RNA sequence: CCGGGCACUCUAACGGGACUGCCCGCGAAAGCGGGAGGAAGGAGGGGACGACGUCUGGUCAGCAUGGCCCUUACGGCCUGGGCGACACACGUGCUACAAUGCCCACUACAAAGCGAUGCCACCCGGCAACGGGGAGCUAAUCGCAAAAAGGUGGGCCCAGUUCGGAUUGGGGUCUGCAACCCGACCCCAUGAAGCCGGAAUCGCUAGUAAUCGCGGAUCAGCCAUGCCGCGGUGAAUACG
């Protein structure tokens, strides 16, 4: 976008919960335009948070997408004729994409069979502080304040 | 998948009718 | 590779079709081939007269063949038999047994064929096309005529090098569907080549 | 007695006829949930009656036609707003914020020539 | 569309498989519209001169 | 997997000149530009030149040669 | 119960000439039941804009066909009068059934 | 179990057991369970040995199998390159045989991709 | 379905409707930002449309045409072969490498088109391609027809396999005078490479990408996975 700003896509809110985070994460899962097969894959996860965990699937949800969310990352620059790595901050909407794009991507990684259980342990793990999401975000967080002396070079 | 003769989706990619996917 | 047909890009408002009758799929290829021979065989012998269109229209085996022509008197001949022998023509082709009309164009410099039939014998008998078409333009504005162009191509005065004298005035909108403008297309023949002549007169808004 | 509201989305009509009763939605004779419950989005069609909170005031006979049946859900939602709002227009400043009675004017678009699918341009390599 | 190909034409093509259509106008052999029994060229050309009845330009 | 239908079908050109042959004997090279034809018990033991597009090729016909086709035997194209 | 279905190329000449036929059936005739729309036949052509390869433009044209669906009640003999030989319309089709 | 051959499906389905068996595909494990009255949905370890010996019974002499059938196939295209038939040559130089073109792609019929200059 | 009626849906002609008109802020103005009302606003969305000219761009092989050249052959007819040749290389595509999947059964919604030496309901024979019989349809009224993903139930349980159908053997159907070179389709058997792809590189900003099927033109048949259209489900992202 040159022009304009690119204003952002308000989506609709959820169907059970009434959370736009939730239909986001609904959208990530959607593959190749089946809505209701990427429904279907989160609620049941949804019914494998409960019954194995005591608390709300919704509050294990948000809490394990702000673990996912991270708080600097590290961006290409030409200078001088060679290509560094800077590290900045992210802006809130990008930490909420790549904490659902790694939660999807995390939980398609697992060795379990089917959709619903990968996304539900998932879930719970990086609630916990732990799974491949939040080893993404301590790389990123690693490569990013791993190269500080180029923090001038911010832009 | 698509391409294989035996089966309904085989059939219906290749516009015929047989054994794997007859007309009811 | 650009400028449609003018023609044919308002053929929906402001322009109609010179064909016009209905015909079903098993028909229309034979009706449409006999207003082809039709139109073949009529430029072949009219164009002495400077027929400028020639509408035809299709009920029931009845064919109503109008031809506009500028100089009538050459298509009705000595006391009316020419149109005699060319209905004769006619009924020889096609069977249909039909009748025939002649409508005089008023201004023949308004209808842009007969303007550019007008600027090929010209140039065919090796007239100087710049003020062949200059000339043109000007007999085309100075009676009414809103707008008008008039395009030569290559080959221009016999040279090596076709080129294209451009020599236009008025108000010529093609991209307005509204213009109402009549085009006009003619070729010449020369011992050196082939010229085309285009012909743009813009006339009305609504 | 009888509130009609048509409702449009996505080439599908609904007609939504609203009766005062129990409740229980009908759609082309079969039950809400024996031609949905299937698709998730297909409470969203209810939203209208949440959104006045009546959910038991009116029930429903719809008559749906056209596209897909999620185009027949936000149809089914257009024609119930409609249908509210002829009851009391006083619900229209309550439906006007939610967009319930805005028409949805997305359709699927053109296939044009050149493309693929009316925008997607053939892939080339130059070398 | 050589003149010797435009024996095409022929009460007795000997079969019926070696019948094939042609450009009524021009001669052509490939690309020969069965409604109009033009060829594509042609039939650009005269839908723009208007001799086709009802034929307009499609736009939606 | 191949099939043409009920009713095999055989060019009638040599059809009756192998007849014809075994009606008196068992004359020599015979050509032949059908190559479409079937072959047919009739004509085993006897030699067809089939033509390959350029020239005739002798084509000695066997028992385990019936229900092929004269060109099967008569490559057109040359490679290598 | 006669029926009526009127084809042609032009929407406005199918129409002036169906408003024509009712104006003259309705002075001699019932209560005529109107012209029904009869939905289009539209055939579509697609042609490559120049005489060589250059795919990628073809500007296609279409051919559409309209019809009419009169249909007078009560065929009462003084409505023939004014109609089975009255007509401007020259590129539209007539069919006629009992 | 052993069934028409030394070959011994073990672990699965009946009918993709059988299939497993060089001249039954799926139809023909289908048709074998259906004419032999055997449920495809039991596993092999769970057969009768009686409904071993009936499966056995029938396919052993229904059609011709393991043995027999690559001998034939091999007999069938040794006739077709014995007799100086076209797709006896096309199989003498490993080409495809039922008319597929060779400028491009049929690598499956000619192997590896030996590159050369130009 | 019958009586029955033009309310709704649809169908196709005409017309209304949106113009920064109204409100607030800014501004010299044009206009910008926001808001109301509205079905929709700040070009509402998509086509048709593509200037003076440039590339001595492409095509005399669609046609026309100057010049040149062949005229017992550089013209013409026919049979057959060839344009389908394969040590190889590239482009464009299709099908995949699977469990957000595959298979089987049942079941539910679309638009745009096509149809008389045509589309072929339905009955019978056949595992099937199909054949025999035969109803309707000059077709908003009959047919192509089944839409598919989807839903429900069941099977498969991570393995080159119930993934994937290349190759090949055998038996057939139809078109056509004729399927060897060189057709599509059906049935049985065969079961390949392929575990998401190096350097490099492409498309797309919303009903778009992705995915799913449907039709059409040319055509006796068809190498269509192409091309042109149609609708179904329906994202991600734009700091700059
Ligand atoms: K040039
Ligand atoms: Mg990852
Ligand atoms: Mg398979
Ligand atoms: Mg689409
Ligand atoms: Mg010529
Ligand atoms: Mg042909
Ligand atoms: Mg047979
Ligand atoms: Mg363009
Ligand atoms: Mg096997
Ligand atoms: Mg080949
Ligand atoms: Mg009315
Ligand atoms: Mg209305
Ligand atoms: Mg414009
Ligand atoms: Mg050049
Ligand atoms: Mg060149
Ligand atoms: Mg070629
Ligand atoms: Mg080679
Ligand atoms: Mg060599
Ligand atoms: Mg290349
Ligand atoms: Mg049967
Ligand atoms: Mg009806
Ligand atoms: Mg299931
Ligand atoms: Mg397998
Ligand atoms: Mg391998
Ligand atoms: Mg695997
Ligand atoms: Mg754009
Ligand atoms: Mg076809
Ligand atoms: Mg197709
Ligand atoms: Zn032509």
């Avoid at chain 3, 085009?183 to 813009?202: M, S």
Wanted: net charge positive; with cysteine; charged share 30%.
């Amino acid at each position: 976008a040159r022009r304009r700003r690119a204003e952002v896509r308000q989506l609709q809110p959820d169907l059970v919960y009434g959370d736009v985070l939730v239909t986001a994460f609904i959208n990530k899962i959607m593959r190749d335009g089946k809505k209701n097969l990427a429904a279907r894959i989160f609620y049941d996860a949804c019914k494998i948070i409960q019954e194995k965990t005591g608390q709300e699937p919704l509050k294990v949800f948000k809490q394990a997408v702000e673990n996912v969310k991270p708080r600097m990352e590290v961006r290409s620059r030409r200078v001088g004729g060679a290509n560094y790595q800077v590290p900045m901050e992210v802006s809130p909407r990008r930490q909420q994409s790549l904490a659902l794009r790694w939660l999807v991507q995390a939980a398609n990684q697992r060795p379990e069979r089917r959709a619903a259980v990968r996304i539900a342990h998932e879930l719970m793990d990086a609630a916990e502080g732990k799974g491949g999401a939040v080893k993404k975000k301590e790389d990123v967080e690693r490569m990013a304040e791993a190269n500080r002396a180029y923090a001038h070079y911010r832009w | 998948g698509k391409g294989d003769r035996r089966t309904r989706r085989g059939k219906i990619w290749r516009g015929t009718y047989g054994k794997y996917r007859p007309r009811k | 590779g650009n400028k449609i047909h003018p023609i044919g890009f308002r053929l929906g408002i402001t322009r109609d079709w010179e064909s016009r009758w209905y015909a079903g799929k098993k028909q229309y290829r034979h009706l449409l081939l006999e207003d082809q021979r039709i139109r073949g065989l009529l430029e072949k012998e009219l164009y002495s007269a400077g027929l400028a269109r020639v509408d035809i229209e299709r009920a029931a085996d009845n064919v109503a063949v109008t031809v506009h022509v500028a100089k009538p008197g050459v298509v009705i001949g000595r006391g009316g038999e020419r149109i005699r022998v060319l209905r004769e023509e006619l009924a020889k082709l096609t069977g249909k047994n039909v009748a025939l009309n002649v409508q005089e164009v008023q201004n023949p410099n308004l209808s842009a064929p007969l303007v550019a039939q007008r600027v090929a014998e010209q140039i065919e008998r090796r007239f100087a096309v710049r003020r062949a078409i200059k000339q043109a333009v000007q007999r085309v504005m100075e009676s009414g005529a809103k707008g008008a162009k008039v395009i030569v191509s290559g080959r221009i005065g016999g040279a090596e090098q076709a080129r294209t004298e451009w020599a236009a005035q008025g108000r010529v909108p093609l991209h307005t569907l509204r213009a109402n403008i009549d085009y006009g297309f003619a070729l010449a023949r020369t011992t050196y080549g082939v010229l085309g002549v285009k012909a743009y007169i813009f006339l009305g808004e609504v | 007695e009888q509130y009609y509201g048509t409702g449009r989305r996505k080439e599908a009509v609904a007609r939504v006829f609203l009766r005062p009763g129990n409740g229980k939605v009908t759609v082309n004779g079969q039950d809400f949930n024996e031609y949905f419950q299937g698709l998730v989005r297909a409470v969203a069609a209810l939203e209208p009656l949440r959104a006045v909170d009546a959910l038991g005031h009116f029930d429903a006979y719809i008559t749906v036609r056209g596209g897909g049946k999620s185009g027949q859900i936000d149809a089914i939602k257009l024609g119930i707003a409609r249908a509210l709002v002829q009851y009391n227009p006083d619900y229209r400043a309550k439906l006007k914020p939610l967009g319930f009675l805005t028409r949805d004017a997305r359709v699927v678009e053109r296939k044009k020539y050149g493309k693929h699918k009316a925008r997607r341009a053939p892939q080339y390599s130059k070398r | 569309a050589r003149k010797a190909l435009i024996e095409k034409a022929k009460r007795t093509p000997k079969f019926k498989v070696r019948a094939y259509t042609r450009c009524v106008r021009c001669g052509r052999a490939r690309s020969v519209y069965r409604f109009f029994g033009l060829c594509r060229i042609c039939l650009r050309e005269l839908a723009h001169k208007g001799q086709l009845p009802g034929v307009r330009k499609a736009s939606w | 997997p191949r099939s043409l239908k009920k009713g095999v079908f055989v060019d009638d050109h040599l059809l009756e000149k192998v007849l014809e042959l075994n009606a008196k004997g068992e004359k020599r090279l015979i050509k032949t530009w059908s190559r479409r034809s079937t072959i047919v018990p009739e004509m085993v033991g006897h030699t067809i030149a089939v033509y390959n597009g350029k020239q005739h090729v002798p084509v000695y016909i066997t028992e385990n040669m019936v229900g092929h086709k004269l060109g099967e035997f008569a490559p057109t194209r040359t490679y290598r | 119960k006669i029926r009526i279905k009127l084809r042609g190329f032009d929407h406005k000449t199918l129409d002036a000439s169906a408003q024509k036929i009712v104006e003259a059936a309705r002075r001699s005739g019932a209560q005529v039941s109107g012209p029904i729309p009869l939905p289009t036949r539209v055939r579509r052509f697609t042609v490559i804009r120049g005489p060589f390869k250059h795919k990628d433009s073809r500007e296609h044209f279409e051919l559409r066909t309209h019809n009419r669906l009169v249909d007078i009640i009560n065929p009462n003999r003084k409505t023939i009068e004014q109609l089975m030989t009255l007509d401007l319309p020259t590129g539209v089709e007539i069919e006629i059934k009992t | 179990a052993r069934i028409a051959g030394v070959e011994i499906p073990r672990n699965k389905r009946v009918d993709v057991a059988l299939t497993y068996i060089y001249g039954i595909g799926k139809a023909r494990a289908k048709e074998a369970l259906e004419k032999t009255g055997i449920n495809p949905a039991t596993r092999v370890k769970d057969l009768t040995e009686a409904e071993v010996v009936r499966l056995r019974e029938y396919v052993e002499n229904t059609w011709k199998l393991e043995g027999e059938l690559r001998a034939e196939v091999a007999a069938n295209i040794k006739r077709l390159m014995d007799i100086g038939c076209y797709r006896g040559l096309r199989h003498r130089r490993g080409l495809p045989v039922r008319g597929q073109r060779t400028r491009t792609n049929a690598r499956t019929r000619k192997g590896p991709r030996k590159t050369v200059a130009g």
